[PDB]
Amino acid sequence: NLENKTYVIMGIANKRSIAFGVAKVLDQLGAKLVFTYRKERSRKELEKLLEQLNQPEAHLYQIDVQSDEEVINGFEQIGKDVGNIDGVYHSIAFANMEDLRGRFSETSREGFLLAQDISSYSLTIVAHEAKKLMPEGGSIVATTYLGGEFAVQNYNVMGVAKASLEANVKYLALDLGPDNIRVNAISAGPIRTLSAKGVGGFNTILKEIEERAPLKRNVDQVEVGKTAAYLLSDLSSGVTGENIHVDSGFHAIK
Amino acid sequence: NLENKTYVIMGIANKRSIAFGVAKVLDQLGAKLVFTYRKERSRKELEKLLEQLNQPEAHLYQIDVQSDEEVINGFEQIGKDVGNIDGVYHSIAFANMEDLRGRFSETSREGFLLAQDISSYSLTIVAHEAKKLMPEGGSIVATTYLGGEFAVQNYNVMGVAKASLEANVKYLALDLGPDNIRVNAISAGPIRTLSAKGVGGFNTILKEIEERAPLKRNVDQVEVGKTAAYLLSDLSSGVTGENIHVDSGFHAIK
Amino acid sequence: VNLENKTYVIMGIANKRSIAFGVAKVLDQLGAKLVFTYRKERSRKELEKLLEQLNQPEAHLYQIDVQSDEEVINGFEQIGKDVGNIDGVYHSIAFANMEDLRGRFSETSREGFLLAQDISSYSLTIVAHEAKKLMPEGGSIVATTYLGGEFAVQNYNVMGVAKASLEANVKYLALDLGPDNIRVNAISAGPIRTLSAKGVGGFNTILKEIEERAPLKRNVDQVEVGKTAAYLLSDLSSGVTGENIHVDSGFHAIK
Amino acid sequence: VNLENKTYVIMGIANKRSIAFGVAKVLDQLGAKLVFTYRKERSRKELEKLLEQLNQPEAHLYQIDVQSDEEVINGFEQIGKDVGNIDGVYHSIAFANMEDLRGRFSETSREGFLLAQDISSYSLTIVAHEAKKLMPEGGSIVATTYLGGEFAVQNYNVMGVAKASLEANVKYLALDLGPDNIRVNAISAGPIRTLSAKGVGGFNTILKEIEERAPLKRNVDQVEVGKTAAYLLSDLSSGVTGENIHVDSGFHAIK
Numbered sequence A, B: 001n002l003e004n005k006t007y008v009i010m011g012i013a014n015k016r017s018i019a020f021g022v023a024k025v026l027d028q029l030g031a032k033l034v035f036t037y038r039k040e041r042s043r044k045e046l047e048k049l050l051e052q053l054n055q056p057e058a059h060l061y062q063i064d065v066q067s068d069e070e071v072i073n074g075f076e077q078i079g080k081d082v083g084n085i086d087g088v089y090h091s092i093a094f095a096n097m098e099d100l101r102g103r104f105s106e107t108s109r110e111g112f113l114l115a116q117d118i119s120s121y122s123l124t125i126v127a128h129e130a131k132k133l134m135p136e137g138g139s140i141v142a143t144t145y146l147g148g149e150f151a152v153q154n155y156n157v158m159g160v161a162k163a164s165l166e167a168n169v170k171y172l173a174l175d176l177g178p179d180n181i182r183v184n185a186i187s188a189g190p191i192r193t194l195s196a197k198g199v200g201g202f203n204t205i206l207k208e209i210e211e212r213a214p215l216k217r218n219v220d221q222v223e224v225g226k227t228a229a230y231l232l233s234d235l236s237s238g239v240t241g242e243n244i245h246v247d248s249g250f251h252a253i254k
Numbered sequence C, D: 001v002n003l004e005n006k007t008y009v010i011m012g013i014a015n016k017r018s019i020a021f022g023v024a025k026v027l028d029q030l031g032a033k034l035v036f037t038y039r040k041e042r043s044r045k046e047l048e049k050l051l052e053q054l055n056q057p058e059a060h061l062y063q064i065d066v067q068s069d070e071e072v073i074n075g076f077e078q079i080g081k082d083v084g085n086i087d088g089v090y091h092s093i094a095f096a097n098m099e100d101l102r103g104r105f106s107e108t109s110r111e112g113f114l115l116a117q118d119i120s121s122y123s124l125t126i127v128a129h130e131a132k133k134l135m136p137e138g139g140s141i142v143a144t145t146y147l148g149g150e151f152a153v154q155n156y157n158v159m160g161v162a163k164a165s166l167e168a169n170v171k172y173l174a175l176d177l178g179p180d181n182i183r184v185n186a187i188s189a190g191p192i193r194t195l196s197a198k199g200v201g202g203f204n205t206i207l208k209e210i211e212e213r214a215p216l217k218r219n220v221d222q223v224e225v226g227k228t229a230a231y232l233l234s235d236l237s238s239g240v241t242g243e244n245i246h247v248d249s250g251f252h253a254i255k
């Protein structure tokens, strides 16, 4: 039960965003949500999607995580508008499409660093700023992929960005632990999203999960949302620094 | 919310047992609970502990997991008394005291094979039998310790039994997944229990958790129980073959 | 490397295809003195015939069923009396019933589970204990494992849980014998066609997935395991202990 | 592990204490020919002095700052014209500012973070892309990492997230270049007193904890890293790729 609880959800672009599944779960559990978006269309999209929720009002903040000042001001404004929060769901990543296919060894410096910046560093600065809104502690959750642990065909630069994310999560857990802020990751199995269209060979992976994973089926955004609710609530007190795979057990086999 | 769920909790010895933390939490969530014990003394303690729960009925079964016939007949009797179940919490391990200190290399065969039998094989046979009471799926959780993943001074023969138990979880998740039965583990931090007195250097390790773990505190049995509820419930659908550390982030640091 | 004046015990040659014979060719080529342990009388016969291919000027063959403490204890003691102190042990031993290496892991019997643990994992612990007496200055111990110890591989079943145990065994032994300057490590070998591999279900399917999907796009051989064994057994790998090295074409690194 | 007739590029010697000079002494002694790359002119001065203790009959020195694509590109191109085809590269390059190596990780600046990624992880990708041109028959690339890349070590902070990135880099390069027979691996060295170590908070207390708590009860040195490098760079490690071998007295295997 998340009544009298408030969470900031970053990275909804449409009905299929992993963060929207996260949203519906927390909303149904009675949380107040605040949403952050980058693109104009994500705001319109958000405004439509909010009609399905019970958020009696639309708390939306444009924040591009490439900008220090947008992150800083955005969280500062959230604090002014809504008060202290109980944690943050981070669901933001980027890499250039050319980098998401062919040969990882041909990755450009620019593309390699862009992926790191958006897909990893953004968690560091979000945590720093979000912490100011969590004086009695809280919970931060980032979304990763098994590609950060093993080399997966095509995932390429986003793999090294996710490995960076996953260690980012461990170092934040250690740094923020004394402040009672837990930091974890959900390693989601493959799910059809706007971002997923950009990754080479996505559909082959979908079928292989079905064939080979212990549960013999793919996961949906709501399954990630249910594990988000656990990690964002007191049910997961004692757990920090962790990466929980919500992937039908695929991580555990070979 | 576990109303109309039934779970079997194996391995309560007294009020400090991890499994009793599991019990309190599931009971508070409205689960029907069934308990299994080895020693006479444990059944006595269980009868007295049930007065603190809202369980309106004592469902208690003697099962020494060294005996197949007790596991087979235990569970068959359980299904006759309560019907189908939704999952099993396994909280059972054992080794001889002199295998919990000194030099690992001096472990006897009977000592090594005893720890494997009770602390690992027991899970396989339990899963096989419990499966018969889960025609529509359910969830099985075993209790492990970080010294299954790394060599910890003193933990010795039990380290190798936990490494075996954690694989057992993965091979069972793979086997039982098509049947919609999830198998997972909780890697609990040190907690003063009856069994922990058997382990050399335990107080030292407790203190080092407070000094070194991200949360700078030890965990307790209710925190384990809280994550057991996540895993034994549908909130964790899509999660299987996983090991979730409830250990204040100690697993993530070095 | 160079290995003249070293002596290694190699446990678990059954025939020309054994991984341990790959080890033996490499060490023997590097100048080492070799001592060989076997269970079946047929393995001794093969060994005697395989010795003609090696530079060893002497057969030192010892029967040792690692199910028996007394055979391990007596065997190592006899080795010590015959060849003096040793520099390391290559352990290439494992067993599980076929009744067990296919179909459902949930149906494994207690006796088959403990069998596999006893031979495939406990053996290392007692061997390590007995071999330490022959290594007063320090030494190196290597066991042979497989990726099914770290992940659940279809069909590898009971033997996966025994490799998990074995890999933990190597870490605990590494911690325990470290101060005696004895290193203990594991080689995680890729699928290789051996007598034991014939009783693993779906083995050929896995061989071919390795070629299609592993970074090197090819399977490995016994000599490749031997060459890493020479590394782990020699001073080249001083500083390295409790380690598991995958000799598997990079397959462990991908999903 | 005789290396006559091989050639290796070694990137990141700055002085006698550098881990890469450990590698260089080991390789040089096995009869390889070495090419060295440096950033600061002081590092070239130090290599000129150090080459006098090696057997190399000539100095092959190239300035390469791995922040510049053109320097990496032109530097490898030139190496290829001067010595022709190579057998592998040892990468021993990392950098982070000193604020970012103590106090609170969460306070790391974007610029500090991306600097460390750039020099300590990306440089490997572009070095592999350019060195691959010199290795038409295959070869071996080895980078240097630290345990801090796998677990959060207090004070290692931004460099640990860079090492996580690096270790994944190795895996993705392994898979990409395997079909070209180029092996890519990582040595995870234990703490060693170098120039770069002077910049990490709490380094001395980590050294002491290794002696007290690691299986071998001692620290490792640069030559021990060189010995494992000789293994990884040579044919002894055929079949091994995407691997990370810990040369750290076993400290990675304990908690």
Ligand SMILES: NC(=O)c1ccc[n+]([C@@H]2O[C@H](COP(=O)([O-])OP(=O)(O)OC[C@H]3O[C@@H](n4cnc5c(N)ncnc54)[C@H](OP(=O)(O)O)[C@@H]3O)[C@@H](O)[C@H]2O)c1
Pocket: A010, A011, A012, A013, A014, A016, A017, A018, A019, A037, A038, A039, A040, A042, A063, A064, A065, A066, A090, A091, A092, A093, A094, A118, A143, A144, A145, A187, A188, A189, A190, A191, A192, A193, A194, A195, A196
């Ligand atoms: N779908 C999967 O199979 C899968 C699996 C595992 C992990 N993940 C992870 O899940 C997370 C969300 O991705 P998704 O699949 O749900 O795709 P998505 O709906 O397309 O979400 C990507 C989101 O990232 C946001 N984003 C990108 N750059 C940003 C920036 N610079 N500042 C602020 N927001 C930015 C996008 O915002 P704008 O559109 O407004 O630019 C969008 O809302 C990512 O971390 C992804 O790596 C996805």
Ligand SMILES: NC(=O)c1ccc[n+]([C@@H]2O[C@H](COP(=O)([O-])OP(=O)(O)OC[C@H]3O[C@@H](n4cnc5c(N)ncnc54)[C@H](OP(=O)(O)O)[C@@H]3O)[C@@H](O)[C@H]2O)c1
Pocket: B010, B011, B012, B013, B014, B016, B017, B018, B019, B037, B038, B039, B040, B042, B063, B064, B065, B066, B090, B091, B092, B093, B094, B118, B143, B144, B145, B146, B187, B188, B189, B190, B191, B192, B193, B194, B195, B196
């Ligand atoms: N306390 C910790 O720091 C810690 C940390 C991580 C993991 N764990 C794991 O947590 C689990 C529960 O242990 P605990 O700490 O809660 O200690 P505990 O209270 O002493 O419970 C251990 C249970 O094991 C049962 N058991 C032993 N052998 C059995 C057998 N042959 N058949 C049936 N039951 C048997 C005991 O029952 P009887 O008394 O009736 O014999 C007892 O109820 C164990 O798996 C332990 O390894 C503990």
Ligand SMILES: NC(=O)c1ccc[n+]([C@@H]2O[C@H](COP(=O)([O-])OP(=O)(O)OC[C@H]3O[C@@H](n4cnc5c(N)ncnc54)[C@H](OP(=O)(O)O)[C@@H]3O)[C@@H](O)[C@H]2O)c1
Pocket: C011, C012, C013, C014, C015, C017, C018, C019, C020, C038, C039, C040, C041, C043, C064, C065, C066, C067, C091, C092, C093, C094, C095, C119, C144, C145, C146, C147, C188, C189, C190, C191, C192, C193, C194, C195, C196, C197
């Ligand atoms: N082949 C592969 O794809 C593969 C991959 C990874 C790891 N491995 C591992 O490599 C090692 C060697 O096996 P392999 O593939 O080379 O097959 P192998 O040639 O059949 O050798 C297995 C050896 O195990 C010995 N052995 C079994 N039980 C024993 C006992 N109780 N006492 C003494 N020795 C006993 C056998 O001796 P007897 O013939 O005298 O009974 C035989 O020499 C094993 O540990 C195996 O698990 C194999």
Ligand SMILES: NC(=O)c1ccc[n+]([C@@H]2O[C@H](COP(=O)([O-])OP(=O)(O)OC[C@H]3O[C@@H](n4cnc5c(N)ncnc54)[C@H](OP(=O)(O)O)[C@@H]3O)[C@@H](O)[C@H]2O)c1
Pocket: D011, D012, D013, D014, D015, D017, D018, D019, D020, D038, D039, D040, D041, D043, D064, D065, D066, D067, D091, D092, D093, D094, D095, D119, D144, D145, D146, D188, D189, D190, D191, D192, D193, D194, D195, D196, D197
């Ligand atoms: N010392 C340890 O305990 C330890 C442990 C594990 C891993 N490592 C790793 O070992 C590797 C070697 O470091 P070390 O300890 O031997 O320190 P070191 O002697 O200071 O070597 C570091 C090298 O990095 C080079 N470098 C930095 N930025 C560069 C750039 N932009 N372009 C080209 N080269 C650059 C330096 O060259 P210039 O001086 O010419 O700028 C220097 O030669 C590093 O990857 C480090 O992370 C060290």
Ligand SMILES: CCCCCCc1ccc(Oc2ccccc2)c(O)c1
Pocket: A093, A094, A095, A100, A144, A145, A152, A153, A154, A155, A158, A189, A190, A191, A193, A195, A196, A198, A199, A200, A201, A202, A205
């Ligand atoms: C081999 C492909 C395997 C399936 C990849 C699963 C996945 C889908 C979408 C992702 O979000 C991205 C991906 C790329 C860029 C930005 C966000 C993501 O992280 C992982």
Ligand SMILES: CCCCCCc1ccc(Oc2ccccc2)c(O)c1
Pocket: B093, B094, B095, B100, B144, B145, B152, B153, B154, B155, B158, B189, B190, B191, B195, B196, B198, B199, B200, B201, B202, B205
């Ligand atoms: C090195 C000290 C580390 C602290 C060990 C934490 C722990 C405590 C109790 C355990 O239960 C046992 C232990 C032995 C036998 C039966 C049950 C257990 O698994 C792990």
Ligand SMILES: CCCCCCc1ccc(Oc2ccccc2)c(O)c1
Pocket: C094, C095, C096, C101, C145, C146, C153, C154, C155, C156, C159, C190, C191, C192, C196, C197, C199, C200, C201, C202, C203, C206
């Ligand atoms: C799906 C499995 C994929 C391929 C398994 C590779 C392998 C072959 C032989 C083995 O030695 C055994 C095996 C079983 C029993 C005794 C010794 C071994 O350890 C691993």
Ligand SMILES: CCCCCCc1ccc(Oc2ccccc2)c(O)c1
Pocket: D094, D095, D096, D101, D145, D146, D153, D154, D155, D156, D159, D190, D191, D192, D196, D197, D199, D200, D201, D202, D203, D206
């Ligand atoms: C608290 C951790 C203490 C143990 C640190 C071991 C170590 C020493 C030096 C390193 O080289 C760097 C480090 C920082 C910047 C550039 C090169 C390095 O990677 C790892």
Ligand SMILES: N[C@@H](CCC(=O)O)C(=O)O
Pocket: B197
């Ligand atoms: N076990 C503690 C206290 C006794 C107890 O109450 O269990 C001891 O060893 O002294």
Ligand SMILES: N[C@@H](CCC(=O)O)C(=O)O
Pocket: B101, B102, B199, B200, B201, B202, B203
């Ligand atoms: N008994 C001590 C350790 C010494 C020993 O086990 O011999 C303890 O319980 O911490």
Ligand SMILES: N[C@@H](CCC(=O)O)C(=O)O
Pocket: C102, C103, C200, C201, C202, C203, C204
């Ligand atoms: N034994 C068969 C697989 C079928 C089975 O073992 O059930 C094989 O080796 O391919």
Ligand SMILES: N[C@@H](CCC(=O)O)C(=O)O
Pocket: D006, D086, D087, D137, D138, D139, D140, D181, D182, D183, D233, D234, D235, D237, D238
């Ligand atoms: N050593 C390289 C190739 C042979 C050589 O160039 O030395 C490898 O094993 O891929």
Ligand SMILES: N[C@@H](CCC(=O)O)C(=O)O
Pocket: D102, D103, D200, D201, D202, D203, D204
């Ligand atoms: N670098 C000093 C202390 C650093 C600090 O106080 O930040 C050390 O040796 O630990």
